[PDB]
């Protein structure tokens, strides 16, 4: 399925993912596309921070869902 990732200014990228994928794996996908390391990535969905060990289906992240990304600098 397809999902969107946005910064707080509205910059948007799109990733092709599966509900089985982990948050840990999605952050890897973002690094491969954009070069931002996962240790710098805070992912938001459903008014919550996403845990790396957890998968997309746990957070009920369906198709065409939008995640937001905040830089950690740490």
């Amino acid at each position: 399925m397809q999902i969107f990732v946005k910064t707080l200014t509205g910059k948007t990228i799109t990733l092709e993912v599966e509900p089985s994928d982990t948050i840990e794996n999605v952050k890897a996908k973002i690094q491969d596309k954009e070069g931002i390391p996962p240790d710098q990535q805070r992912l938001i969905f459903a008014g919550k921070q996403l845990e790396d060990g957890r998968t997309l289906s746990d957070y009920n992240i369906q198709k065409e869902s939008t995640l937001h990304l905040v830089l950690r600098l740490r």
Binding site: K6, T9, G10, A46, G47, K48, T66, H68
Partner: protein, 89 residues
């Protein structure tokens, strides 16, 4: 709302002024239309404002385009706005 738009219109003018050292007086909002995208944890709005401002004390018409993204999550919310276009008729 009308007042909220007015702040955006002023924002467009003051920011335009800063970028060109342009000396525009703000008079009023003439038309206002918006495009909104609604997603999880955010509302994105593109404002198409036509405002009237004085250049030499004579009122003139300008087109402003202001981008606003509001993003919120538990315990936090962010508001970002940007002037994207400012042009005369």
């Amino acid at each position: 709302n009308s007042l909220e738009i007015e702040e955006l219109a002023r924002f467009a003018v003051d920011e335009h002024n800063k970028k060109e050292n342009a000396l525009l007086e703000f008079v009023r909002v003439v038309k206002a239309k918006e495009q909104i995208w609604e997603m999880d944890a955010s509302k994105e709005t593109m404002y198409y404002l036509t405002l009237e401002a004085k250049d030499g004390g004579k009122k003139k018409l300008y087109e402003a385009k202001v981008w606003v993204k509001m993003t919120h999550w538990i315990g936090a919310m962010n508001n970002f706005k940007e002037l994207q276009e400012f042009k005369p008729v």
